[PDB]
């Protein structure tokens, strides 16, 4: 029943400089590694198909240019937000896009901070933990242009959020609990960012789907061996 709960019964739900628990190259499988390696063969086919289309269309140079820009713009956007919320890139559309979201953000308790689940044995790096319109949540910022477009599905974004909150709720480095999630899609053209707020009930529904992905990963033979070390969110 409560063998793998998202919520920690023992931690305070409510409960001033944000936590940055460092992350190093490690052999604990990350949240994004788990999701990437357990994408449905149907999803993998769609992304590989689109990858081959883009290589042919753009050429090897044009492909390198495209992938490099979307990756770096994804990273720069995240670095900017980490600098904004903790004591050059500010003219971007992505930053302009999140302004109406950032007005409603307060009580930032963590930023780009490692989370490791003590029972389930996965690790990750959550973007931010803060109150959005008074409600504490794990926030994950997203760019409308995917930073790793051929190995990521936007439709896995709710699972990534619930993985982080679950991990954080069962991590002795964190003394509080988090019950809600938020995904924020910033648009490259400066259009207002879209918030997808996830209450406790919805997080629990997606958490169940995350455990199915996590077990599907640990069902494999190669993942019983110790992975090669990597820094992965
Ligand atoms: Mn991140
Ligand atoms: Mn993010
Ligand atoms: Mn990764």
Numbering used by the authors: 98 to 112, 118 to 189, 199 to 344
Task: Show sentences the authors wrote.
MGME1 (also known as DDK1) is a highly conserved, mitochondria-specific DNase. Human MGME1 (HsMGME1) protein is composed of 344 amino acids and belongs to the PD-(D/E)XK nuclease superfamily. Structural analysis and comparison suggest that MGME1 follows a two-cation-assisted catalytic mechanism of substrate cleavage.
The apo-HsMGME1 structure belongs to the P43212 space group and contains one HsMGME1 molecule per asymmetric unit; the monomeric state of HsMGME1 is consistent with our gel filtration profile and a previous report. In the apo-HsMGME1 structure, residues 1–97, 113–117 and 190–198 are disordered; the β3–α5 connecting loop (aa 255–264) resides right under the helical arch. The side chain of Phe261 forms a weak hydrophobic stacking interaction with the side chains of Trp152 and Lys153 of α2; the backbone O atoms of Lys257 and Pro258 form water-mediated hydrogen bond (H-bond) interactions with Tyr168 and Thr169 of α3, respectively. These interactions may help stabilize the conformation of both the helical arch and the β3-α5 connecting loop. Though Mg2+ was not present in either the crystallization sample or the crystallization buffer, the crystallization buffer of the apo-HsMGME1 crystals contained 100 mM Mn2+. Two well-defined Mn2+ ions were captured at the active site of the apo-HsMGME1 structure, which was hereafter referred to as HsMGME1-Mn2+. In addition to three water molecules and the side chain OE2 atom of Glu344 (the last residue of HsMGME1), the B-site Mn2+ was also coordinated by TLA and Asp238, via their O1 and OD1 atoms, respectively. The average coordinating distances of the A-site and B-site Mn2+ ions were all ∼2.15 Å. Unlike many nucleases, which coordinate Mg2+ (or Mn2+) through the side chains of three or more negatively charged residues (Asp or Glu), HsMGME1 coordinates Mn2+ through the side chains of His180, Asp238, and Asp251, and the main chain of Trp252.
